[PDB]
Amino acid sequence: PIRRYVLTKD
Amino acid sequence: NIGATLVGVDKFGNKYYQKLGDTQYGRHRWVEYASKDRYNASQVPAEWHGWLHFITDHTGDELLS
Amino acid sequence: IGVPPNSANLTEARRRVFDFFRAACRSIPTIMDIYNLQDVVAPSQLRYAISAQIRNNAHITDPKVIDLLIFKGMEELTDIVDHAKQRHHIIGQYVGKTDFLKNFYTSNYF
Amino acid sequence: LLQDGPPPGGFAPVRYARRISNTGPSAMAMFLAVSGAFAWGMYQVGQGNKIRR
Amino acid sequence: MDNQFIFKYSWETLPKKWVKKMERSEHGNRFDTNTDYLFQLLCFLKLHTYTRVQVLIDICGVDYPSRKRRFEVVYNLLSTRYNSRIRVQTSADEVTRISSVVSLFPSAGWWEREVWDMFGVSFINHPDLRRILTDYGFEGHPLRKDFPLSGYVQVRYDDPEKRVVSEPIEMTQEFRYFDFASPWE
Amino acid sequence: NFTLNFGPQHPAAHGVLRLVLEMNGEVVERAEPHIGLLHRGTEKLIEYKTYLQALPYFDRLDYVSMMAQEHAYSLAVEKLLNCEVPLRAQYIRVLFCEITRILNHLLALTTHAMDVGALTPFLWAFEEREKLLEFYERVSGARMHASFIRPGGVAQDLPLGLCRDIDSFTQQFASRIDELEEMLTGNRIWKQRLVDIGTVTAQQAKDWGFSGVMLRGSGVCWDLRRAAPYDVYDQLDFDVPVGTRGDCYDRYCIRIEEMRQSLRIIVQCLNQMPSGMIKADDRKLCPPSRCRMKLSMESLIHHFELYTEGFSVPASSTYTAVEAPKGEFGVFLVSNGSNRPYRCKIRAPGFAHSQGLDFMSKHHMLADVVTIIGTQDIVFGEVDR
Amino acid sequence: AKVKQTTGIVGLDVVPNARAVLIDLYSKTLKEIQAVPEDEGYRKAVESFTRQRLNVCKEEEDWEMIEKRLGCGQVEELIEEARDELTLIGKMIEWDPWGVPDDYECEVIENDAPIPKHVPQHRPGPLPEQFYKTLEGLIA
Amino acid sequence: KVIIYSPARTATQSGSGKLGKWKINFVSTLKWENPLMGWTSTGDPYANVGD
Amino acid sequence: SKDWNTVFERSINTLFLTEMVRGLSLTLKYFFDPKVTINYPFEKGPLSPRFRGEHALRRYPTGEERCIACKLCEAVCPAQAITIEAEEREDGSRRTTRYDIDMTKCIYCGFCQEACPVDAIVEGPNFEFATETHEELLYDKEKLLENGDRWETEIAENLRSESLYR
Amino acid sequence: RSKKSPMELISEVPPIKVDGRIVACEGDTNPALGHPIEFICLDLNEPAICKYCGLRYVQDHH
C-alpha cells in the first residue's frame, strides 16, 4: 500500500 | 554435622543429611564428606547432585531406579 | 576551537595546510620533552619526516579531501601531544639479486 | 492445560505504603533526664572531692 | 499532536525547499531535508509553539554503500508536552561537512563525536569532534560496511619490551559467515 | 587549576570510568569522563547475526535490567513484523520488566550508598535480590542473563510452583523496603550529603536529554509506560512519582517510590494472569513444540528454517522506545528485508546521563562527584556499545 | 484567588502578574510579524493563534482562568512559549527562507503498514479547539 | 586486486531470488589449519567482508 | 515561622542525635536473628531443572551416539563456538568425526540445546568445571561424550521432568 | 564399558521382529524424547537400518 506521488509547482 | 535425619549413603562414603524448616530458607540439606583432605571441592555423583541443589525431590537412591 | 567550514577552493586549503604544519612544528618540543627521547633522535629530522608525510599526499586536488586530511592530522597531533598515545609508538611510526626472487623465496602470494 | 496462575479467589492483599512507627526514646523528657542527672552528679562529685580532701 | 495533525501542520506551516521529501506512516513521521537546511529546520521545530520539539533523543547513522550520498544521519526528536515523535534525516557523504546542532540541543555534543567515530562524517562549528569510542591510535571508521568485523590490528603483550603493542590481525579460527539467504523471497 | 587522574580499577566506583577533571584545590570546575573503555562492539556485531542470534546482545547491555532490555528489541521486531502476541505473554513480560525495575533500583540504591559510605544496607538488599535472581533462575536457564523474552512471546512457559513463591516474596518485600528506607531517609548524614547536590532544572534536563528519573526529578511527568503504553499497562493501576527539586535526595525518594509502584504492578499482574498460549500464532516466527516437530512435516520444516535462516523482517525502519529502569531505552532497527538487521543503533539512557555530568558537577566538591555518579545510575555496558 | 505559590517545576519560579508580561509579548509578536509575507502558512498561523491567545487573555483577569480556559499548560509556561515564538520570528526574518524554487519536487509517501496494539505507540487525548480551528484557516 | 561480479544462480535450487546483486570479491585465498584443533586460521582481514 | 514550642523540640532532636540512635537501634535487630549464608562446600544453593551449565553429549540407551551431524546447533550458536565435521561411516549412517565446543566462546545461552531435533546436546546442571589451563576448556568430542555419560542418570531425568514445556 | 566404539556396539544389538510391512521408529519409548518418527519399508532380505537410531528391523512373516 504504497502511495508515492511527487510534488511539483507550475 | 548434625541434623534432623540422614538420607541414604554414597559409594564414596559421604553422608547426606536433611533438615526441614517452617518458613525461611537455610540449613535444609548438606553433605558431610567422607574424607577431609580438601574434599576435592567436587565429589558428589550425578545421582546426588540433583538432590543437593534442590533440582529434584528424588533422594538419589531413588534416582537409580 | 570549533571545526571550520570546508574550504571553497584549493588556495584557501593551502594556507590551512601551512597552518597545520606550522602548529605541528610549534608543538614538536613538547613530544620530545614529555616522551623522554633525546639520544634516539634529534628534532631536525622529525621535520623531514613530517614534510615527507605531508608531501606524499600532495597530488590531491579536491579541497574537501585536503581539508579532511588536515582534520585527521590535527586529531593525530592532539592524540600524540596529549597523554593518549603510548611510548615506542611515535618512534615506531616516525624515525642484491632482485626483489622478485626475494618475494618468490619468502612466499607464493608475495 | 495446567497453566501456572493465581489461585481461585486471588492472592491476599499486601501493604506497600511505608508504615511509620514510633520507637524513639521520648520527645522532651530526655532534656530533664540529662539536666537533673548533671545537677545531681555534680553534687555527688562535690561530696567525693570533700571526702578525698 | 497525533501523526496526521502534525503532518498537516508541518505540510502547511513549514517553508518550502526545506523538506526534500516526507513520509507519514505508523512506524514514524519522517522529514528528509537536503543536508544544508538542517540547522534551520531543527531551530524552527524547536521554537515553534505548535511544534515544541525540545529533546533530541539520539543521532543515528546508516551506511549505504550503494548510493552516491553514501551515509545518512538520522535525527530522532521528541516533543514532551505534545507527546509526539519526529524523525528528521539527511543524506551525507564521506568527504563533506554537514552542519552541527549542538547550539540547539547541547546533548548532541557526544552523539556528534560518536557519529564521526563510527562512520567518518565530519561536522562544522562543533567544539571537539574527537574520537569517543575507539582506541586512541585507532585508524579507520568501524561502522562503515567496508571495515572488516575482525578489524585491522590485534593487541598482545610481548616480553622483549615490557609494554602492550599492537600488531597485524591474525586469528586462530576465522569468522564463519553462514550464507542462509534463499530464493523465493 | 591542577588536574588529577581519576579512573579507579574496581567496581567500587562502577569500574571502567576515567573521569579526568579540573580542580581548584577543593571545588571541581570541569569534569571530562573518558568513555570507550568498554566499547565491546555490539553495534557492528549485530549486523552479522540473524534476528534470533542478536537477542543475547541486548541482555549484556545495561546488565542489571536484563529483561527490560531485550523487551525493547522484541517490541521493535514485533512492530516491524505486525506480530500479535497473546495476552498471557504480555502479562508475564510486564511482570518480569517490573522485576527488572526492582532489581535495578535496589542495585543502584545500594551501590550509591556504598559509594557514600553506608555499607550495611548493601548486603541486606543483595540478600533480598537473591530471591528475585532465584525467580529468574526458575523460568529461564540462567540467573542473570536470561533470554526469556523472544519476538513472538516468551521462550518457555512459567513453572507450576512460581506464582506462589512470587507472592510470598511480595508479602515481605514492602517491609524490607521500609527497613532499607528507615536507615537513609530519616538519617541526618544522608540528608546533608545529598540535599542541594547536582540540581538540574527542567529546561536543562530537556535540553540535555535526561529522559528517565533525571527528567522526573525536575518536575516533569514524562513516563513512557504511561504516555506511550506498549504492553498491558492501561489495565494496571500505578502512580508516577514526580520530584520538586532537582537535587539528589528527591531522585532517591523517586526511586524508592518507583520500587513501591513496581511492587504494586507485580501484585496486579499476579492477580490478573490469564491462561492461554505464550507464543504468537499469526505469523511464523515461533518454534514449533518439540512434541510436535517430531511427528509433523511442516512443523519440522519450520523448525529447521527458523533455527538456521530465521524470520525475514520486511524492509522498513523504526525507533521503538520502552521505559527502562535507567530511563528511555530505544532501539533503531533498519531492516534490509533479509534475515539479518541492516543497522541496529541502541539508544542507551546512560549515555546522555553521563555526558550531562559536566554541568552537574559545576562548582561542587570532588567527593561531591561520586554521589552525582551514583545518583544517575550509570553502567558502562550501555554507555559503550 | 491567591498567588501561584509553587509552580511544581524546578527552574520555573513564579512570575507574579504574568498576564501583563504575557500580553506584552503577544503584542510584540503581533506587531513584529509584519515583516514576513501574508500569503505564507507560517504567518497565517502565528497571527491566528497569537491573536486568539491575546483575546482570551484580555477577556480574563486572573491566571486561574487564563490557563483554565486555554488549557495549554500553566500561565508561566506560555511565557517562554511566547518568548521562543518571538525569537523564532526574529531568526526567520534574518534567514528569509521565502521563495518557492522553480525546480522544486517533494516525494510525499503515504505508506500504511499496520502495527500491533501492544507496541509502544503514543496515544494521547484530543487537543483544544484552537489547535483545530487554526488549520481550517490555514487550508482556506 | 579485486573482482566485481554478480553471483550466479545455484544449480541445486530453481529459485532466482538471490540474483541481480553485485559483489566485490577480494581474493582472500590465504587460509590454513591450526595444528591443535583443526580450525581454519586467516591473516587477511578481508576474509569475508565482500560476502 | 516558629511558636517557641516547636523550635525547642527541633533543636533538642538535632542536638541529641535521636534520628541517629534510631538507625543505630535499627541496625541491631538482625544481630541476634538467624543468619542466611550457606556452607558452600557442604550445602549448595537451589537450582532449577532448566539450569544451563557445562554441556554434555548424550547417547541412546542402546549405545549409539545421539548426534546425527545435522549442524543445526553449529548454525544457531550466536557465539560461533561449535565446530562440527561429519562423514558417512562404513556402517552407512551419518555421524560426527570432530565435534568440539570452545567453552571460552560459549555463553551458555541454551540455543544449541533447543535446536537439536534429536536432543543430542544438552546443558547439564554441572556448574563446577573451572580448569587450570586454557587448552583444557576446548571441549573435544570425547570429553563432551564422557560428560554426557557421567550425568546421564540426571540429565535424562531433567529432560523428562520439564518435558511438558518446550 | 567404553572399549567398544558405538559403531561396533550397535551391530551386536539383535534386530527387531515386525509382523507388518512398515514399522515406525520413534527412538525412545516416549515419542517426545526420541528422534523424529521414521517410517521404514522393510521388504528386502537384509535388515532395514533406522537412519537416526541405527536400530535394525527384520520382517518375520506377514
Ligand SMILES: CCCCCCCCCCCCCCCCCCCC(=O)O[C@H](COC(=O)CCCCCCCCCCCCCC)COP(=O)(O)OCCN
Ligand atoms: C553507655 C556509655 C556510652 C558512651 C558513648 C555515648 C553514646 C555515643 C553514641 C554515638 C552514636 C552517634 C555517633 C555518630 C557520629 C557522628 C555524630 C555527629 C553528628 C553531629 O556532629 O551533628 C552535630 C550536632 O550533634 C552534636 O552536637 C553532638 C554533641 C551533642 C552534645 C550534647 C550537648 C547538649 C548540652 C545540654 C546540656 C544539658 C545540661 C545543661 C545544664 C551538628 O549538627 P548538624 O550540623 O548536623 O545540623 C545543623 C546544626 N547547626
Ligand SMILES: CCCCCCCCCCCC(=O)SCCNC(=O)CCNC(=O)[C@H](O)C(C)(C)COP(=O)(O)O
Ligand atoms: C609529531 C607531529 C604529529 C602530527 C604529524 C602529522 C600527522 C599528519 C600529517 C598530515 C598528513 C597529510 O597528508 S595532510 C596534508 C596533505 N595536503 C596536501 O598535501 C596539499 C596538496 N599539495 C599542495 O597543495 C602543494 O603541492 C604543496 C605541496 C602544499 C605546496 O605546493 P604549492 O606551494 O605550489 O601549492
Ligand code: SF4
Ligand atoms: S544439533 Fe544436535 S544432532 Fe544436530 S549436529 Fe548439533 S549436536 Fe548433532
Ligand code: SF4
Ligand atoms: S549454549 Fe549458546 S553459545 Fe554455547 S554452544 Fe550452545 S548455542 Fe553456542
Ligand SMILES: [Zn+2]
Ligand atoms: Zn529410530
